Design a protein around this ligand. Structure first.
Ligand SMILES: O=C(Cc1cccc(Cl)c1)Nc1cn[nH]c1
Ligand SMILES: O=C(Cc1cccc(Cl)c1)Nc1cn[nH]c1
Lengths: 304, 304
């Protein structure tokens, strides 16, 4: 009973957090095996984030300029390289707490947990999603750079995000663990506006299924729709277009509740057209889109 | 930038989760030093949760009937005792992963993180609050019993909650780590209705301060109120009465923003009287009450 915005247990990732200092800039690194991953802007001063030439700035840095501290003990840096917008710091010691891991690049609409860190130390964990405009709506102050986003499948941590930047609009931009930014963002102190933040339609439907499973059924109606009819309404409300792939992924939720995906689309169509009318669904007064269909099944079944 | 429902990093608590089996019932235990804490209903069959006499049921149980497994290794039970609604299982081995810890009994309005577990294994972490009716709005399926609620101050885990029961209304009831239930709930399969779920006024005000700090200011008005005037409105909307202790605790948030607590009370009074009018505050279309003033400061300052 109950449905919550739930993050993955963060222990496996906590054992990987380290502090990286270069010059006067300090941020977080991720220590997996004998490599520490961190944003390449650790080599910049605030006075040079305006137009950095990372390759030129890196020439003035040696292994001994990267101060890596895991807890209260210093790691010896024996190599360094830049891969896209991340630095890979080869250290002389393999992290004994390295979990089974993968580096994955996620698609918009996919959710992940963030272990927010400052000075290599974890402050909190929250669940968020890669927005359709490739931003994330996080909670990150200065110094949170290098904090990572991840998913867990039994004992394997799939790292998908590394935090780099806050846009002037208070939304967040970062890279996958290969250093490639999600979206068109660059690691520069220049105005970069985000595109339309559309709603993740398949996730809203998954969350409506979760609501039915937990007793919130007031929004269920006597109607049905088609993918093309639904999508006309989705376009009008800045919702992502629903495809047959999305319908397929909602299959298990549809099978569990006995509510056809297109009937749930009609319920969502009425919610968009009429609003909530002062009512709530799973404690929310707006349509939640940061639960994937997989998250709903996982939480509703008790996967560990 | 950004404000999220954030849980504490769960690693310290993950290292304490074990599985406890008695007969055919399996739930979670908390292993701290050489003692495993778990709900006493682990000794019950579903056929006897209707009217259990725990003292009589416990007479038929010996140390060897409590199967305690930490990961894939079995702990030897050398003693057992019942303290209120929890069982304390003395094991022959101190948990090497025991963090610095305390057992605290929280007041309504206070928030904590829950590490939801099944079969001694963590599934997720979420932030919730002790409701004014002494229930919690969690996410707990059968077998989640023994999952714990906690807070962390640097390296010390203060355990405040152990999950025991779901009420027929889908809300949750549990105990502190001394086995005393929060509220009037008993560990029996009998209908127990919760009281009025009032809104935690001081937490809503703290969250309104967090919204101002992060840029959401549309709700700020030209008005002020008094504690007695505000409380008349709070009574009408099932909000907890605001006291001078609550005003005092909001002092640092008032000092940071330059917004007098009573002026913020007037903003909240208008929000209650007029609603949101289709608008949102920190991504929410309702007034959030599960952030304490301490949570807002901690998150807004980056405490680790
Ligand atoms: O955004 C930054 C620094 C920065 C400026 C410009 C570009 C880059 Cl890569 C990084 N600080 C931040 C605090 N919280 N989240 C991010
Ligand atoms: O509530 C229970 C079992 C129970 C019944 C009656 C009393 C007691 Cl103590 C415990 N199952 C549950 C699943 N999720 N959360 C709780």
């Amino acid at each position: 009973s109950g449905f919550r915005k739930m993050a993955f247990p963060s222990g496996k990732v906590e054992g990987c957090m380290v502090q990286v200092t270069c010059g006067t800039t300090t941020l977080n690194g991720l220590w997996l095996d004998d490599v520490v991953y961190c944003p390449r802007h650790v080599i910049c001063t605030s006075e040079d984030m305006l137009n950095p030439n990372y390759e030129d700035l890196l020439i003035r840095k040696s292994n001994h300029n990267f101060l890596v501290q895991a807890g209260n003990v210093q790691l010896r840096v024996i190599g360094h390289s830049m891969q896209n917008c991340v630095l890979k710091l080869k250290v002389d010691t393999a992290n004994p707490k390295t979990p089974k891991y993968k580096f994955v690049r996620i698609q918009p609409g996919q959710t992940f947990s963030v272990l927010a860190c400052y000075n290599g130390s974890p402050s909190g964990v929250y669940q968020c999603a890669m927005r359709p405009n490739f931003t994330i709506k996080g909670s990150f102050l200065n110094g949170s750079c290098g904090s990572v986003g991840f998913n867990i499948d039994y004992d394997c941590v799939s790292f998908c995000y590394m935090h780099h930047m806050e846009l002037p609009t208070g939304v967040h931009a970062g890279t996958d663990l290969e250093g490639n930014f999600y979206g068109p963002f660059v690691d520069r102190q220049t105005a970069q506006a985000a595109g339309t933040d559309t709603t993740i339609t398949v996730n809203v439907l998954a969350w409506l299924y979760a609501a039915v499973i937990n007793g919130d059924r007031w929004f269920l109606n006597r109607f049905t729709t088609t993918l093309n009819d639904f999508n006309l309404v989705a376009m009008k409300y800045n919702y992502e277009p629903l495809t047959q792939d999305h319908v397929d992924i909602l299959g298990p939720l549809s099978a569990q509740t006995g509510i056809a995906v297109l009937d749930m689309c009609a319920s969502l169509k009425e919610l968009l057209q009429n609003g909530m009318n002062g009512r709530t669904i799973l404690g929310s007064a707006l349509l939640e889109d940061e639960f994937t269909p997989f998250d709903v099944v996982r939480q509703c079944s008790g996967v560990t």
